[PDB]
Amino acid sequence: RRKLKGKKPPEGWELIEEVIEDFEQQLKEAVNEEHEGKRKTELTWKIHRLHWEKNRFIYDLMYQRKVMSKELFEWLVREKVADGALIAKWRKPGYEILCSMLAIQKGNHNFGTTSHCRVPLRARAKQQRITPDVQTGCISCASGDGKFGGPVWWNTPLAKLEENRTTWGQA
RNA sequence: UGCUUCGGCACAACUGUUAAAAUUGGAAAAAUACAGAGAAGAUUAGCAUGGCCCCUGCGCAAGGAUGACACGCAUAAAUCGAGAAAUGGUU
Ligand SMILES: [Mg+2]
Ligand SMILES: [Mg+2]
Ligand SMILES: [Mg+2]
Ligand SMILES: [Mg+2]
Ligand SMILES: [Zn+2]
Structure with missing residues (x-):
């Protein structure tokens, strides 16, 4: 709503507008899915x-x-269209494909750690190498670990890039 | 992803009471049927006491049949010796 109220969006918004609205429609239907x-x-x-x-x-x-x-x-x-903290993080060295800000909140985790997905898949034990984080669903958002430019999510074949992430582009 | 003597460095570092379960057991209630109320004649107000009894309540109130219970139904032997007499052994 916040962007839709009153004011005008700056120049450029016409390029990203349909994609942003598509992402918002996808989130709108994710919230509405069934969980059984x-x-x-x-x-x-x-x-x-x-x-x-x-x-x-x-x-x-x-x-x-x-x-x-x-x-x-x-x-x-x-206007809350972009997560400013998460994009700000992706700029930091080492946080380049961080899956969520939850993954590196350390009060968030029992032992005061980050989540096991922040740990390079190599340096982990076979137990923490195929299990996605219970909160984010990320198996590995360690920079270096990323398939297709992003994390290794719950179902990311360690297939083809097109089958594993949304591929906006400018047609 | 920076920095790169382009060799590589740097950065970043261990989620999950782990189930979409599986058992697993214990529970209040309902009906049924039981049976169904203090004090001394009856009818009745209560306020207590005690505690491995609780319930309602925010409760250091108040209430719950005086909330209940207990409360004795004491077959709680609370129990026995004094002396004369008299009889039994022994001399
Ligand atoms: Mg009383
Ligand atoms: Mg009372
Ligand atoms: Mg009365
Ligand atoms: Mg009473
Ligand atoms: Zn992650």
Whole structure:
């Protein structure tokens, strides 16, 4: 709603508008899915992956292609279209494909750790090498571990890039 | 992803009461049927006491049949010796 009320969005918003609205429609239907037959912990996995992909479109255009304006990006952050903290993180060295801000909240975890998905899949034991995080669904968002430019999510074949992530592009 | 003597460095570092379960057991209630109320004649107000009895209540109130219970039904032997007499052994 926040973007839709009153005000105008800066120049550029017409390029990203349909994609952003598609991502918002996908999140709208993820919230509405049914949860019978899947773990309690996996409720929000699709929401987290979709939130990642949405902010990764905003990130892709703002910092990897740099086709987004500083004022448009600052608008998206201010109007809550972009997760500003998560995109800010992806800029930090070592947090380049971080799956969620939950994964590196350390009060979030029993032993005061980050989550096991932040740990390079090699340095982990076979027990923590195929299990997705219970909150985010990420198996490995350690930079270096990423398939297709993103994390290794619950179902990421360690197939083809097109079958494993949303591929916006500019047709 | 920076930095790169382009060799590689740097950064980043261990989620999960792990189930979409499986058992697993214990529970209040319902009906049924039982049976179904203090004090001394009857009818009745209560306030207590005691505690491995609780319930309602925010309760250091108040209430729950004086909340209940107990409460004795004491077959709680609370028990026995004094002396004369008299009889039994022994001399
Ligand atoms: Mg009383
Ligand atoms: Mg009372
Ligand atoms: Mg009365
Ligand atoms: Mg009483
Ligand atoms: Zn992760």
